[PDB]
Design an enzyme around this catalytic site. Structure first.
Site, mmCIF file in Angstrom:
data_model
loop_
_atom_site.group_PDB
_atom_site.id
_atom_site.type_symbol
_atom_site.label_atom_id
_atom_site.label_comp_id
_atom_site.label_asym_id
_atom_site.label_seq_id
_atom_site.Cartn_x
_atom_site.Cartn_y
_atom_site.Cartn_z
ATOM 1 N N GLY A 166 32.342 34.143 28.348
ATOM 2 C CA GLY A 166 32.224 33.018 29.319
ATOM 3 C C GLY A 166 31.711 31.697 28.764
ATOM 4 N N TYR A 208 42.518 27.799 30.772
ATOM 5 C CA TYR A 208 42.936 26.492 31.354
ATOM 6 C C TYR A 208 43.352 26.557 32.808
ATOM 7 C CZ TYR A 208 43.108 25.745 26.305
ATOM 8 O OH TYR A 208 42.841 25.718 24.964
ATOM 9 N N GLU A 209 44.277 27.452 33.106
ATOM 10 C CA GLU A 209 44.697 27.657 34.475
ATOM 11 C C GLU A 209 43.511 27.974 35.449
ATOM 12 O OE1 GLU A 209 47.451 30.899 34.440
ATOM 13 O OE2 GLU A 209 49.126 29.588 33.769
#
Lengths: 166, 166, 166, 166, 166, 166, 166, 166, 166, 166, 166, 166
Positions: free
Chosen positions: D93, D130-131
């Site tokens: 993360g 990214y999405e």
């Protein structure tokens, strides 16, 4: 119509000539010069220095003199004033005019508190121009300047903005 | 036909002359100048600095003024606008035109959010030019500027792009 | 014993750290910096520029903050004041002290006429520190600063030396 | 606790190492570098250039990556984002965090309108990061990059601040 | 007879004039310019930089336009093409010619793999010139450019040398 | 045993500290400084300038003060003298000693004709040190210095070599 | 584990030592050097020149050699390859490895079309390393190099990327 | 009367024009140029570099070509020769003359051992000029140059002083 | 064992100390210095100037003095000699030795024709050292030096190589 | 009317010509020159050096000579005087005039104590000019100058201001 | 094991010491030096000048001497050789070795045609070292060097590569 | 009337032309030049170097040649003489004159002890000019110069001042 105009690079020949009319050595930002070639080089070295400010005194027909504010100090808010008028124009009120305008510039534009000058204690004609603009003698500095083979006394004279506006 | 044109090196004599019509001291990228020779040297020093942008206001026959955007800030997206029109051309709509075009440049080209200016609180003719372009007073800054021997109050006025497009 | 001390090169890490505690971008002589390495390079570039003056606020044990006088103008005699105290020292009277001393420095040492500041119109704790030192609001500058994704309004506040000595 | 911190000169070894983990050639202000010694020299050359901005991604224990905003354009208000996380820290993360923070920095601090990136059309794991941050594909740029002996297609992806705040 | 000729220092007035016909801000090696004086200084700064290459488009009688190859990348072998023809010469086939020659230069001289361009998605006349030279749309970049007060969408179009030789 | 020793670069911390004991702004070759870092940079800039000359006053155990000769003029042969003794050493005869030695240096080594100083007209303890070395008051310069919020009067005092040798 | 690593400033002693093992004069960006001190100065002069690229060949325990790509030409897409392995490590497969990796770098990273080298026509062991990597002789350049008192013939050998991928 | 004359700064327009007659990119001390303005700047940068030497080929009436000796190596004593004759003067024996003189200069003045050249393997007219001066083919360098969209083969040809004097 | 050794940078503290033992102002290549810091800077400025040459006088245990040859003129072949021995070593024959060696250096190494010196006409001990080395008085220069408040007469003394070899 | 005027850059051709009339080598700030081109370069190098001062001697019609004050020393207050009059003007009283004026300048303007000169002991006409201005011989410096193949003796002559005013 | 090694910056103390063992003045690239500090500065000035080449002569235990090739001329292919061996190592064959190696370097590496030297016609031991390496006397240059108060004759000796290989 | 005049910058075209009449390469302060543009740049680089001195030989009507004194050594007091007379003026006594004057300059002005020259052992006409001025052969330096494809022998000839004055 007389006027004061900011000194340009192209004024330096006049500056050179005027100061050449006096035997006392001449300074540009406290560095001595005797020739136009020295003056041009000092001019470029000190181009953005705010400790001195100079104006050309003119009428419509020619340049007639120079006003110099030097040792400008923006903390104590005082500066030394030097004015030289071509000797051929003496008594024509160019000196009075130059004074009036430079004092106005120092006080009302630059926000100075006090202006002062030094004058040879024998230079009665200059002293009278100064006195007529409200300068008062604050000191007699003995043997302070060496000129033409003799140490000479100078008056320190000054003008307070507070006196000026009364 | 009027137009705004980007300021060139060869414009600096005009710039010098115009600012010379005002007793308030003049600045180029926040450095003071009083002569053309100082202005030329500051111009070369700041040649690629994007914090100020200047335009010459023209009609087909001559240069009539200058538009300056200064303190341009690309994070907060605001800048200060200064416009000076030769006083001989007052009331001819050069000021209105210069304003209209510079506001358009600031908002639509530079993508500013807000434009502001300072104006002497006694300069009614200027304030009215500003007000007619939609500037609103946001502040009255007392004794903020020293001019002609007096501290003077200035209005801070501003225009939001959002107000501009309504 | 608290005191103000002139900012040295060796203070720049503290300066960097302090400004890093705030999301608003930081400036040194109007050039932005985000790292210590940028700050060191700007420091050397502007080393003798008199338009800003900075002090470190200390007690005997550590450095606790910074006083900045910026946009110092020696003609109009005003400057903008910025004070940042480490947030861990809030309410301990370091801000009051820093203010008192910097105002004294601006007025009695630098001979300023007026001091001013900008403050986010929501920053009540800061405004109260300012108000307790005699700052008055002269303007409400809408959408003047972009911070944390929003344009925010700022008060322009100011203090006149003449009010200060009453 | 993770955080983004501004990149210092002393970060350049990490920067060098990270980029060395990828065969694609690396750039600093659009000038290529392959060694730490080149990187140090480019760093000093571009020290005050505002077209790129870089952050080190950290947890309390070590530096874990870099965020780069490049091609920053303050007129069109967009910039390209590049994030590299040490491959040993994938799935922890850090990439999500770095993204979240850099987007916030671009939009809410720098006041950008749009952010975009390029990604190899085969890099599914990156595309998904990214999405998940709301990037949308706007283009498929065929044979745009030469990598490991082949011309490869890249997606141009972008995020509008207006989409971001919904 | 038309021809492309390498851009000289003496071409910069033409370059300045041409770009002045468009409200979008102009760049020289990614540094913005609005005046001829800025353009001359950027020209000397970037004189041997190979990342951009520019040609003047001529007929025997006058200069009619400019071809720019920018963001030239010799690893990925692609570059961005910009062509501006004086609007008074539109429809005379100068744009077609300039294109044909610049594409030939990029592919057959510079050995590029791909050429691309950006075009406002409303600029149908330009898009048709591009399409007639074999450019294909690879992307629609929304709100990518701010022009005349609006964010506008741009097509990314491109041409592969492999398509060119078929 | 007291002595005067020429000022070295390594003396500048002492110089900084001493001048820091006074609220009046400090100058090095007429350029203002408030920090050690500014002082070091001015020192290197003026390293071979003969218009000022400085000595450290010592006893065998520590540095106790500084003697400065400034505005040294080798035509008119006069200079301004400034002496600062650490206030903790007052009344111990360091000031008398420093004076005696500096006067000797000015007259017998530098061949000056006259030495002068300025002193706040309220600083009786300093004036008495001066008077005991033969300085005479030549002027009372009203409102000449701004210190601690007030314009203050200063005496101009001086000593002629001819008086000194009698 | 062997690897190629980009050459740093700190590698120059090794570089100096290695080249010192050969009587043929050594060059850095086509300027000759015989000492480490010359090599350091040439290194800084050519620091960002892209016409040569160098790698250190290593195993986990030490540096064992250098790979040089020189005369890199990004239009014709070819470069000259030079590899020197410490003679004490001959036959250990460092030369094979260095070759394999540098060829891969030239073709797949730098996008070269062709690589070539020169080799003394008597250096059978080198020629065999070259031949085993697919280099073919294209020329026999007679009396091309002066070495140990004799003009010697050299083979020009080359490798096409197209042959490499078959 | 033909002659070779050393190349002056004032020859650079001719040099520019001549090289402009060929699509292959042109180099000055291995740095590329396409304009006269680039050529002038490279000329001044390399003014005293002895690795290249250039002559203008003339008859009494005009300049007709250029002789270049490049990659001059004073250890191995060889150099590469390039001669370009204005195409309008082909077959007039200017190429033969230029060759004869440059070979004489290389061997008898510069004391070279060998001279060589590269020539497109399709350029029969050039090859025949070379062969008539005694150049022999030593290599066929396949796909060595990219010209007009194709990789082309080049002959390496050479002349030994020892062959020359037989 | 005594010896003369060429003066190094590391000798300058000794030089400073020695000259500090005398009230007469000290010069380095005709520029005055009073501190070690000035001396170091003048040393670097004049590092390769051949008009002065200096030696340190030593015994095995310490540095005991300095020999200076100044105003070295290689046309007229004469130079001025200055020797200073630490006063604590007087009468130990260091001065005789230094003289003997420096004269030998001037005549037999530098090929001077004549050496000369100046000496205060009251300095009998120095004059006797000079006379014992064959110096003859050629002049009595009245009031030539100002020292300790008085103009003093100096002898010009000299030694001809022709007298030296008799 | 004769006069002395400060030497300008434009005087250097005259200076060159005059000194060219003498076989003895000529110096500018102690650096030798034989051509006008050397003189121009030395002039710019020494432009603000106060150790020498030069005047052009004129009548209304032409420049007739030069006055040089050199080795000016402002501690000991003495300088060396050199005067050269065009030989075609000898006996016309230009030398007397130049002397009179330069002595006046040295003593009454520069505040020198003593002036001195050197003169070939055979130059009776010069010596008589000197003697008529009150110079006295203080020394006979044997073989001090090498001129026209012979070492020649020179008188050291001097004038004390105290003698001058009697 | 003896060897020649290229001279580094760190060798300069040895160089200084060795040359200090001889009264004849020492040169670095034809500029004189007497101290290590001068030698260091000349070293950096001439760092990439190919007209001189220097080697340190060593055995495994210490540096024992220096080989200098100077006046290297790559057109006429000759150079002057200077070898100095520490006098404590005379007769140990270091001079023979140094010679042998330097001659080999000049002829077989640098491709010189001829090497020459100068030697005092009284230095029989040196001449014999030279003669044993095949140097022949070509000239007797009378009074060519001034050493220890006398003009001395020198032999010019030389060695042709053609003689060397027989 | 013939004369020697010091070489000016404006003489360099003549210098260039004269040396161009000879195939042997030409040097300015030991740096080679073949063009006027190289000569101008070397001239400015070596402007105050005293190791060479040059004169233009003239009659009233034109410049006819050049005298060069090179390798001037002021310790050993010798220099090399080179004289070139335009070949069209041979036998007119310009060479004799130039010689006579330059020898006089070297001996009687520069105070040289010895002058020498090198001359091709086949150049009988030059040797006879030399011999008629008293030059004696001291050496025959075989294969010392490479000229027109051959190594040629040179005489070293010299003239002692002591022989000159007999």
């Amino acid at each position: 119509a007389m006027k004061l105009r900011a000194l340009e690079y192209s004024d330096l020949l006049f500056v050179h000539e005027l100061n050449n009319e006096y035997s006392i050595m001449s300074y540009w930002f406290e560095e001595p010069y005797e020739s136009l070639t020295e003056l041009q080089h000092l001019f470029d070295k000190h181009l953005l220095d705010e400790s001195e400010r100079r104006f050309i005194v003119e009428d419509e027909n020619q340049v007639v003199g120079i006003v110099e504010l030097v040792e400008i100090n923006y903390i104590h808010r005082n500066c030394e004033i030097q004015i030289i008028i071509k000797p051929e124009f003496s008594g024509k009120g160019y000196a009075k005019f130059a004074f009036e305008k430079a004092i106005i510039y120092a006080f009302n534009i630059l926000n100075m508190h006090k202006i002062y000058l030094y004058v040879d204690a024998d230079n009665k004609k200059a002293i009278h121009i100064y006195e007529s603009e409200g300068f008062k003698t604050e000191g007699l500095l003995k043997e302070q300047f060496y000129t033409k083979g003799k140490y000479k006394d100078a008056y320190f004279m000054s003008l307070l903005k507070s006196e000026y506006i009364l």
